[PDB]
Amino acid sequence: HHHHHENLYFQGMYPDLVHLGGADKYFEEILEIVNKIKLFGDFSNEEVRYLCSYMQCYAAPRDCQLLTEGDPGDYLLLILTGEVNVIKDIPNKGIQTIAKVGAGAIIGEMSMIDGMPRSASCVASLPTDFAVLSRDALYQLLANMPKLGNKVLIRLLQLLTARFRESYDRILPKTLGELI
Amino acid sequence: HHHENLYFQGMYPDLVHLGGADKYFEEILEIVNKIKLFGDFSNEEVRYLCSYMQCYAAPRDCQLLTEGDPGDYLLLILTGEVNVIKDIPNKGIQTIAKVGAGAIIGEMSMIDGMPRSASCVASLPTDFAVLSRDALYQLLANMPKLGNKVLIRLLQLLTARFRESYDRILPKTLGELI
Ligand SMILES: Nc1ncnc2c1ncn2[C@@H]1O[C@@H]2COP(=O)(O)O[C@H]2[C@H]1O
Ligand SMILES: Nc1ncnc2c1ncn2[C@@H]1O[C@@H]2COP(=O)(O)O[C@H]2[C@H]1O
Numbered sequence: 228h229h230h231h232h233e234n235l236y237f238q239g240m241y242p243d244l245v246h247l248g249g250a251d252k253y254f255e256e257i258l259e260i261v262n263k264i265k266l267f268g269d270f271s272n273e274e275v276r277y278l279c280s281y282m283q284c285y286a287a288p289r290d291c292q293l294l295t296e297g298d299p300g301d302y303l304l305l306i307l308t309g310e311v312n313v314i315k316d317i318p319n320k321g322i323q324t325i326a327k328v329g330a331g332a333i334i335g336e337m338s339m340i341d342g343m344p345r346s347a348s349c350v351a352s353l354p355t356d357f358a359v360l361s362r363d364a365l366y367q368l369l370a371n372m373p374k375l376g377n378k379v380l381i382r383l384l385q386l387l388t389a390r391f392r393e394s395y396d397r398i399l400p401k402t403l404g405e406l407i
Numbered sequence: 408h409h410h411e412n413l414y415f416q417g418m419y420p421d422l423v424h425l426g427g428a429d430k431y432f433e434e435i436l437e438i439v440n441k442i443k444l445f446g447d448f449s450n451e452e453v454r455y456l457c458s459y460m461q462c463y464a465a466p467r468d469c470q471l472l473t474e475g476d477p478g479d480y481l482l483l484i485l486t487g488e489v490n491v492i493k494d495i496p497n498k499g500i501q502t503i504a505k506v507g508a509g510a511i512i513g514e515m516s517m518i519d520g521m522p523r524s525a526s527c528v529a530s531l532p533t534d535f536a537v538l539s540r541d542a543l544y545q546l547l548a549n550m551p552k553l554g555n556k557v558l559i560r561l562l563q564l565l566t567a568r569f570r571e572s573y574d575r576i577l578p579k580t581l582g583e584l585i
Contacts, residue, residue, distance in 0.1 A: 266520050266540070267547075318578040325577075325584050340559070341566040342444050346573065362444065369445070373551035380558035381518075387565040388515040392524055395572075399495045399503070401580040406503050 229363055230283050233302075237359070243291045250282035250358040256307045257282075257358060260331055264382045274375050281368055282358040287351040293334070294349040300338035301362040306330060309355025315347040326394065327352075333386050339365070340383070409461060410539045412479050421466055428460035428536045434485045435460075435536060438509050442560045452553050459542040464534045471512070471535070472527040478516025479540040484508055487533025493525040504572070505530075511564050517543070518561070 237244050250257060258275045270278070284307065287293060293304060296315060311334060313326035325347060328334065334349050339362050369376035399406075413419060428435055436453045448456070462485065465471055471482060474493060484506060491504040491512070503525065506512060516523050517540050547554040577584075 267544070315573070315577065317580070320578065320580065323584055327585060337566045337569065340444075340562045343566070343570065346570055366445070369552075369555045373555050374547070377547050377551055377554045377558055380555065380562060383562060384518045384558065384565065387562070387569070388519045388521075391515065391565065391569060392521065395524075398576065398580060398584060399493065400497045401582060401584065402495070402498065402576060403579050403581055406501060406576055406579065407505055 229361070229367075233359065233361055234283065237285060241285075241287075241291075241293075243288050245286040247284040247286055247356065250279040250284050250305075251276065253284060253305075253307045253356070253358060254279055256330070257305060260305055260333070261378070261382055263331075263385075264378060265385065267378065267381045270375075270378055274378070277372065277375065278368070278379070279358075281364040282360050284356060284358045287355045287357070289351060289354055291351040291355070292348060293351055293355070293357070294345050294347070296346065296348045297344045300335060300345050301342070303333060303335040303339040303360050304349075305358040305360070306332040306334065307356040307358060309351055309357075310353040311355060312350045312352050313347050314350065325398075333383070336383055336386065410480055410537055410541075412477060412539075413537055416476075418465075418470055421469055423464040425462040425464055425534065428457035428462055429454070431462055431485055431534075431536060432457055435483065438483050438511070439557075439560055441509075441563070442556060443563065445559045446556065448553075448556055452556070455550070455553065456546070456557070459546060460536040460538050462534065462536045465529050465532065467529055467532050469529040469533065470526060471529055471533065472523050472525070474523050474526045476516075476523045478513055478523045479520070481511060481513040481517040481538050482527075483536040483538070484510040484512065485534040485536060487529055487535075488531040489533055490528045490530050491525050492528055503576075511561070514561055514564060 261270045308330050310329045312324050314322055314324050316322050338345050435457055439448050486508050488507045490502045493503050494500050512527050
């Protein structure tokens with residue numbers, strides 16, 4: 228049902244997307260993504276099959292704008308295949324690529340988590356398949372299976388800390404003058 | 408019981424133990440209930456969480472966190488002001504952020520086990536609560552639904568930090584970023 232209306236949104240908003248059906252078709256890829264979790268213990272096969280039931284998948288073509296800076300968004304994307312350019316309209320610099328990600332990446336977590344507009348645009352540079360997790364689906368997972376929920380949240384925490392460390396190791400040395 | 412990593416810090420003898428976070432319940436409540444979308448912490452929940460934390464007073468110029476150190480704990484800043492300082496390859500040592508009352512710092516190493524990404528130095532005398540990774544593990548094991556709320560709070564801390572840092576730092580960059 229959630230997925231029914233989620234699908235209407237994607238097909239309505241995202242004309243180029245082809246619906247692939249349930250994320251169980253990408254169990255092995257999703258298992259690998261989530262089991263990058265460290266320090267807190269892995270997801271079981273059974274836990275991953277359950278998580279897969281919360282998600283539907285889509286194929287995007289080359290040059291598909293998966294996410295657009297400044298748009299509202301309540302969903303994140305697990306990149307199963309392909310390549311995505313993360314770009315931002317940076318004051319005093321114009322539109323620039325801040326990151327390039329591929330198979331295994333998670334994108335769109337920020338607005339899904341905090342309800343602010345998208346921080347950057349994400350464009351499929353190659354044909355790209357992905358699973359979608361909405362905030363509503365996450366709500367339901369935390370309500371129903373909170374321990375699994377905390378594995379998911381720890382995975383997203385580690386995604387963000389790694390991204391923050393990598394990004395600012397790359398970006399700070401390119402800065403000019405005083406930062407504060 | 409004081410958290411091991413903190414106890415054995417070089418600056419530890421400069422700290423004054425203020426007691427349990429229960430003594431700072433209102434301050435803790437104000438920090439954790441910045442949570443959005445997913446539901447607020449009840450007062451009972453915040454009381455329970457307080458049992459997992461000790462509070463300390465640090466003097467001015469205290470190096471609360473040191474870049475490169477092991478870091479299995481985070482700090483909730485109750486009062487004071489803190490400079491986030493980093494050794495930037497090519498640029499040198501710079502203040503990259505300033506935070507104050509209500510801020511959370513040290514979340515990155517606590518979450519991922521890498522060495523501290525920056526130093527955090529009290530520019531005014533600063534009081535803080537300490538949450539260890541061990542305490543978090545117990546909380547998740549003992550009380551997963553309350554755990555969910557702590558984790559969402561930390562997620563939102565990081566997303567906000569990403570966004571606010573982007574808005575401030577990216578416009579100061581020169582050339583290609585990747
Ligand atoms: N430095 C980065 N590295 C990788 N991905 C990023 C980076 N910054 C932003 N993103 C992604 O871009 C997405 C745009 O939408 P969100 O802000 O919801 O979530 C953002 C992140 O998933
Ligand atoms: N841009 C920033 N703004 C606020 N705090 C930061 C920033 N960069 C790093 N920090 C904090 O500095 C801390 C150093 O220890 P951690 O790496 O564990 O966690 C880090 C963050 O809590």
